Amino acid sequence: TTEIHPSCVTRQKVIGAGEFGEVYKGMLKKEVPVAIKTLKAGYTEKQRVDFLGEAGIMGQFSHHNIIRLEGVISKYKPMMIITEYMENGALDKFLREKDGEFSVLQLVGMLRGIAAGMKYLANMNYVHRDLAARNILVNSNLVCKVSDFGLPIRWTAPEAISYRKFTSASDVWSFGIVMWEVMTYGERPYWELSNHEVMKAINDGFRLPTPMDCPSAIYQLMMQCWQQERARRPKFADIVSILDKLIRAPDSLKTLADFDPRVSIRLP
Ligand SMILES: Cc1ccc(C(=O)Nc2cccc(C(F)(F)F)c2)cc1Nc1nc(-c2cnccn2)nc2c1cnn2C
């Protein structure tokens, strides 16, 4: 994996926490902004294996919709994982701060990009296990990049919760939840239901209702991601294909699913 010399890296601001270190925004040497995850003195053998293993898997991904690794510092302490930096930050916070500001076509385009990144990961035999809008970064072209910042009952498929079966098909369930997050501008899935109430509702057959202003085709697709039977869910190749066809014939997105009102206002 590309080894970066520490003299080329400047840590500027803390932006998060790692498993045994912090996460920073900084600059990498024509300076480019970067995000930097460190592994601090005293880390265990397993932590080092997991940290360098993470850099190793990230280094082999090369896709428009997957966060790009700039390189690693392994020859000096503290060790570092260095990625490109996305000014617009995480998708969930981004949408909540930009409520109502995008077109349907822009929102669906974000979903196609996420789906393309997930198709790539699944094809590379990588199961994400924590796909959610909080783990997707947005650049200044509105391009979404699948990432994993570490630690999600309400995003997780029933078989993964029940017996720890994490596969690309449980990632498809999570993707359906991400579709709902995007189309609602970052609403909390299942609102104030507790984790136990969410699992009970899912087991009883209930599913998230349609977002406001949501294309019928998009709601139909997210519903098929939430089939109880894992084998019936679309594969990521199916999701990408459908989203690409809807975008390329954008009148297909003008037909909206009915929104169930929770509140009735009667006026003359
Ligand atoms: C430094 C770093 C190390 C690893 C990862 C990361 O995504 N790792 C990862 C691990 C397994 C699988 C994948 C995936 F497959 F790509 F998704 C990615 C991301 C980052 N970059 C980050 N960027 C950012 C960030 C980047 N741009 C704007 C705002 N924040 N935040 C991060 C992180 C890590 N944690 N946090 C909170």
Indicate if 117 and 227 belong to the same structural domain.
yes
- The CA distance from 93 to 98, in Å, is 9
- 191 Cβ neighbours under 8 A, 6+ residues apart: none
Resolution (A): 1.4
Return the closest-CA partner of residue 182 out of 158, 224, 227, 218. Answer: 218
Instruction: Tell me phi and psi for residue 112, to 5 degrees.
Output: -60, -40
Q: Which domain holds residue 26?
A: 1-86
Helices 168-183, 236-248: crossing angle, 10 deg rounding:
30
DSSP 8-state symbol, 76: S
Burial class (CB in 10 A: 0-12, 13-18, 19+), 251: exposed
The sign of the dihedral angle between the CA atoms of 116, 129, 208, 144 is negative
Task: List residues bridging with 144 in a β-sheet.
Answer: 138
Number of domains in the chain: 2
DSSP 8-state symbol, 39: E
Indicate if 20 and 117 belong to the same structural domain.
no
Longest dimension (CA), the chain: 74
Task: List residues bridging with 10 in a β-sheet.
Answer: 27
Position in ligand 1 atom list of the atom nearest CA 18 = 35
Distances (CA, A) of 237 to 2, 85, 227, 262: 31, 28, 17, 35
Instruction: Tell me phi and psi for residue 205, to 5 degrees.
Output: 100, -5
135 and 148 Cβ atoms separated by less than 8 Å? yes
Give the Å distance between the CA of 33 and the centre of ligand 1: 14
Which one of 37, 56, 86 terminates a domain? 86
Which one of 52, 86, 120 terminates a domain? 86
* 67 Cβ below 6 A of ligand 1: yes
Helices 104-123, 168-183: crossing angle, 10 deg rounding:
170
Indicate if 155 and 44 belong to the same structural domain.
no
111 and 104 Cβ atoms separated by less than 8 Å? no
**What are 47's two structure tokens?**
């932590």
Instruction: Tell me phi and psi for residue 166, to 5 degrees.
Output: -100, 120
Q: Which residues of 36-63 are buried (b: 16+ CB within 10 A; e: fewer)?
A: bbbbeeebeeebeeebbebbeebbebeb
Looking from the CA of 23 toward its CB, the CA atoms found within 13 Å total 12
* CATH code at position 32: 3.30.200.20
Q: How many CB atoms lie within 10 A of CB 200?
A: 12
Does the annotation count 130 as an active-site position? yes
Single out the catalytic residue among 50, 92, 99, 130: 130
Indicate if 4 and 15 belong to the same structural domain.
yes
Indicate if 93 and 208 belong to the same structural domain.
yes
Indicate if 27 and 105 belong to the same structural domain.
no
Helices (H), the chain: 45-59, 91-96, 104-123, 158-163, 168-183, 195-203, 216-225, 236-248
Indicate if 100 and 227 belong to the same structural domain.
yes
Position in ligand 1 atom list of the atom nearest CA 148 = 7
Q: Which residues of 75-101 are buried (b: 16+ CB within 10 A; e: fewer)?
A: eeebbbbbbbbbebebbbebbbeeeee
State the method.
Answer: X-ray
Which one of 43, 58, 86 terminates a domain? 86
Q: Is 100 annotated as a binding residue?
A: no
Give the Å distance between the CA of 149 and the centre of ligand 1: 5
Does the bond joining 215 to the residue before it have cis omega, within 30 degrees of 0? no
- The CA distance from 82 to 247, in Å, is 34
Indicate if 94 and 81 belong to the same structural domain.
no
- The CA distance from 57 to 86, in Å, is 20
Q: Tell which one of 11, 14, 27, 37 to mutate to probe ligand 1, the residue whose CB is within 8 A of the most ligand atoms.
A: 37
